[PDB]
Design a protein around this ligand. Structure first.
Ligand SMILES: Nc1ncnc2c1ncn2[C@@H]1O[C@H](COP(=O)(O)OP(=O)(O)O)[C@@H](O)[C@H]1O
Ligand SMILES: Nc1ncnc2c1ncn2[C@@H]1O[C@H](COP(=O)(O)OP(=O)(O)O)[C@@H](O)[C@H]1O
Ligand SMILES: Nc1ncnc2c1ncn2[C@@H]1O[C@H](COP(=O)(O)OP(=O)(O)O)[C@@H](O)[C@H]1O
Lengths: 371, 55, 55, 371, 371
């Protein structure tokens, strides 16, 4: 038997089989419902589109994300997402496959409890397990120490690990991510004349962000460069023509990661929460952590983010340390890759939570040594 | 045919611009590395002269 | 009009391959300069250690 | 010297002097041009009528608004509007008076820059300043905290302010307003046979709206009351005669503000964007914001809108807070009143953009700390 | 002439006159600065609020503490705090009043030296003196022998004293205190879905802790009873609503004092450092020290901490010894009471550091016999 590695994320579902080199199914975690009335009789419209289909019918739907910041807020939508993943994308029967699921640090406990209750009762999986995203990133990176910065789409977090032991008191979690960057980019494009308001235009703005945004190495110098030159402006082609041209908005959007006061948050940038997690860690492992700073997740994928973060952390740390930032090209899928590695490990086969254990001890079994 | 070759030339322009701007970013991070190198150099040469004089 | 934006696409392709060959030649010269810089910085780091040891 | 206060708005120009209790020139923001040929020689008729004269010559002209949603789209028309305001309604020389202009939040920047350029080059004023409409509304209301909902004729926006500090990340802007309500009423009045299609029958429909429409405290109960009785059905007399009778669409028109799906918009009602702005603010100013919910602008003048807003926000917010809605009788002029207060403040005489500052720094000087 | 008694501490300034039963000015030692834009001209707002004023405007300010763990880390902020205490809370001219200050054992020397330099040059007092907090606790307790546990807000320490002689080699200092308990409570509240991230929400969490937390007599049995029943659940009403329900983290928070491994510290609990200070003392005084175990400071104010510490120390010490724990109801102010007593003693008037002594000897006069 083989296991299923479903990294449900928050804004992208990634599923596949344990032992693969990459996820087989990657689609947005979206549930769309029609908002107009529907006149053609006989074509038999359905009531909810889930996944990559909702992006095709995007023009006549209201797109909902069932998961807000790591946390699941709509359990019916999430059951639809999982059903679509199991049956219409992987085409497997979950009654005969263990399932490894992934979660961010410092979430509510009812999240995991309801997740496993659903997986055992609605889908009847034989076993299941919930892993932390950062640990799986560090598996897939081929390290055993290092401070991992996993910037997804709802949540950003640092998890310092040394020699296979994690330092829980030094785990930092920040609720600024790609979704807030998209909202800031909408709000900041509005000052050039373009307005995107609907949930179906949020997707167009997310595409603009992915395709044109980058991190400036020096924010003030890039601002002056954009104010004087015009060599920074790119054009983008909306899905109906009418090209839009954006200038300093390209590097002004992901700069919110380093100055979260742009969106009215009080906290510190990612370069500073990384350093603060390191300084919470014990003094004997800080050199290794400085040398093994691992990036993963979709929001770490801007051009120039590694160079920017190295410049910042280097200016912060003592001048006699080797700051080094590991940013693989397959960053976005690191959590899934590590999950596949972990579920294929042979030592792991007695760490699943079986159906018998669940029927014995209730959903509370999730927080036990079978974590 | 005219539209086809238009689109192909466009996508090639896109690829070339990607490569060129990435090279620009690389050369900028390199020249910054070089100035940081040079300032570390002056500092370490100065502590070298100090160490040699005191020795 | 197709031949018009076609000719502009082709001249953009010419100057774009110009920018691309400049990107590649520049990155070659800058990677050579880089490797030189790291040779220099490592030899001077070892020399700094020697100096502090003699001190 | 005295400063002028020109509240351009979008659909009604309001001008006056700084230090008065009310504007002395309120006229529509329309520019009409004749559409027929014109036969009587010696009539010597003009080519474009501005303001209140166009409303007299409606039947002969095509009426155009130079401001769509806050944004100015026809700069020649807007320049005619300003010339009329300065020379024919107020009878002042604009080269002797500072001018305070107003604008809505989250507009393009070229709007504000071109406005400044016009006011300095064409009209040659000595100083000028562009202010936000919601802040001026809060000046006129006598508060210093509170979340203001300024529903004009182009745009609707919430701007939460606490102790004189505005929270920009919580500013909301919606493009539903009186113009969209007029269009919806034109559309649903065809269910009874009345047809208003001309650009000059829109003014008749706007008059019908102002005089007969009201907000229902409960929408289904009023729907049933209109379906059964006829006690809520009222009549109106056109400029031609032939009275029209308005039934349940007396309250279906302004209900679009609370159900923007009526006009096919995706967004949420004003009662819900207000609450979302609250919940986007901090946690320890929300009680004051709930207690100081300020209404202004012409689209808030419906009967029953304050009671409806209170019922809705009360059902939304927690059950332990006093929700209060401030709705003065002189709502429609609140922005102008606050503008007069501000421009008369002696502290303000150092916030003007003088002409020499402009001549030396270009029109970009508008977005500086005078923003 | 009268002396002032300013007990700074790390998070609550409390001052007054020597010869009173209580301080007349107790306020948090925070300095807030506005972090938002500021739109209302003529509001004339300030740039930094200190003390209790900054607590009313939390939703607008970013709150700093100028004292981290006993140690002062922001001298400008501390100078502001002292200026506020002298002129606005007390309304006295500090150039005509001797001032008694306190600090914790085993702090840096520059802390104390710079403190006296400020008090002589800036505030220009005629005399001053710095006292150890535990000694003043022992004065106020009415004893001359005993081991005093002074858990403040940044630092905890034991200071054994016998017949008025302090045994410096047995002084223990621990950097676990109320601030770390607040951070741990913020971290474990996220298990139920509540998130407090802002510096202004740290204060909400501190009030929650003060009002609801208590020390369990038996930690494992309390965990079992919280898992089984629901009689421990208690609700708290935030500044808005969404009343939060707190379960076993009512007593999991202050249990960090007895198990510092919860927050990833290596050290041992307060009961064990107390016992270790005892066994570090001589053998002829351990009986009196067991019988005179004095608690003081705000973190010793949890319900049940005295009984818990007695149970632990009794299990540690030999069976033939009677352990006693003195916990007055005015523990939070014991250091100030003792400071007032000491400064009013007529014998003490020869122990002040006069201004001429300072002028002639530099700030080094503070570690000298003029202690
Ligand atoms: N090339 C890119 N540049 C910038 N952002 C990107 C890029 N690719 C994806 N993203 C962002 O990453 C987010 C998705 O991150 P992801 O790794 O899928 O997290 P999750 O799996 O939890 O949704 C999207 O919101 C998208 O905006
Ligand atoms: N008593 C009323 N009831 C309903 N709507 C009104 C009333 N009075 C004015 N309005 C609407 O208000 C709009 C004008 O609002 P106003 O405050 O003038 O905004 P602006 O100045 O930006 O045009 C008009 O479109 C009109 O339809
Ligand atoms: N009744 C209480 N229960 C628990 N903790 C308390 C109580 N009252 C105060 N505290 C804690 O005590 C701390 C303040 O202690 P305090 O005596 O002011 O020390 P310092 O003066 O050194 O700051 C605060 O952090 C608060 O959390």
């Amino acid at each position: 038997t083989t296991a299923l590695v479903c990294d449900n994320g928050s804004g992208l579902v990634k599923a596949g089989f344990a032992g693969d080199d990459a996820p087989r199914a990657v689609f947005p975690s979206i549930v769309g419902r029609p908002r107009h009335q529907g006149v053609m009789v006989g074509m038999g419209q359905k009531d909810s589109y889930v996944g990559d289909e909702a992006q095709s019918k995007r023009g006549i739907l209201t797109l909902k994300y069932p998961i807000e910041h790591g946390i699941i807020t709509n359990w019916d939508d999430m059951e639809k997402i999982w059903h679509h993943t199991f049956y219409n994308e992987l085409r497997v029967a979950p009654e005969e496959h263990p399932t490894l699921l992934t979660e961010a640090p410092l979430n509510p406990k009812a999240n995991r409890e309801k997740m496993t209750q659903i997986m055992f009762e609605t889908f009847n999986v034989p076993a299941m397990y919930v892993a932390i995203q950062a640990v799986l990133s560090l598996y897939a990176s081929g390290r055993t120490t290092g401070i991992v910065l996993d910037s997804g789409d709802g949540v950003t977090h640092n998890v310092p690990i040394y020699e296979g032991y994690a330092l829980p008191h030094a785990i930092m979690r920040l609720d600024l991510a790609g979704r807030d960057l998209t909202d800031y980019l909408m709000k900041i494009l509005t000052e050039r004349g373009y307005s995107f308001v609907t949930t179906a235009e949020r997707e167009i703005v997310r595409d603009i962000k992915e395709k044109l945004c980058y991190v400036a190495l020096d924010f003030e110098n890039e601002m002056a460069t954009a104010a004087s030159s015009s060599s920074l402006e790119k054009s983008y082609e909306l899905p109906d023509g009418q090209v839009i041209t954006i200038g300093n908005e390209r590097f002004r959007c992901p700069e919110t990661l380093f100055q979260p006061s742009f969106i009215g948050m009080e906290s510190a940038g990612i370069h500073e929460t990384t350093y603060n997690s390191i300084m919470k860690c014990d003094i004997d492992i800080r050199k290794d952590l400085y040398a093994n700073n691992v990036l993963s997740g979709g929001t770490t994928m801007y051009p120039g983010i590694a160079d920017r973060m190295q410049k910042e952390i280097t200016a912060l740390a003592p001048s006699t340390m080797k700051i080094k930032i590991i940013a693989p090209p397959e960053r976005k899928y690191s959590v899934w890759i590590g999950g596949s590695i972990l579920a294929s490990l042979s030592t792991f086969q007695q760490m699943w939570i079986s159906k018998q254990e669940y029927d014995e001890a209730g959903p509370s079994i999730v927080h036990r040594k079978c974590f | 045919r005219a539209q086809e070759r238009l689109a192909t030339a466009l996508q090639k322009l896109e690829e070339a611009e990607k490569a060129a701007d990435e090279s620009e970013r690389g050369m900028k991070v390199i020249e910054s590395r070089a100035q940081k190198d040079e300032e570390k150099m002056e500092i370490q040469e100065i502590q070298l002269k100090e160490a040699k004089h005191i020795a």
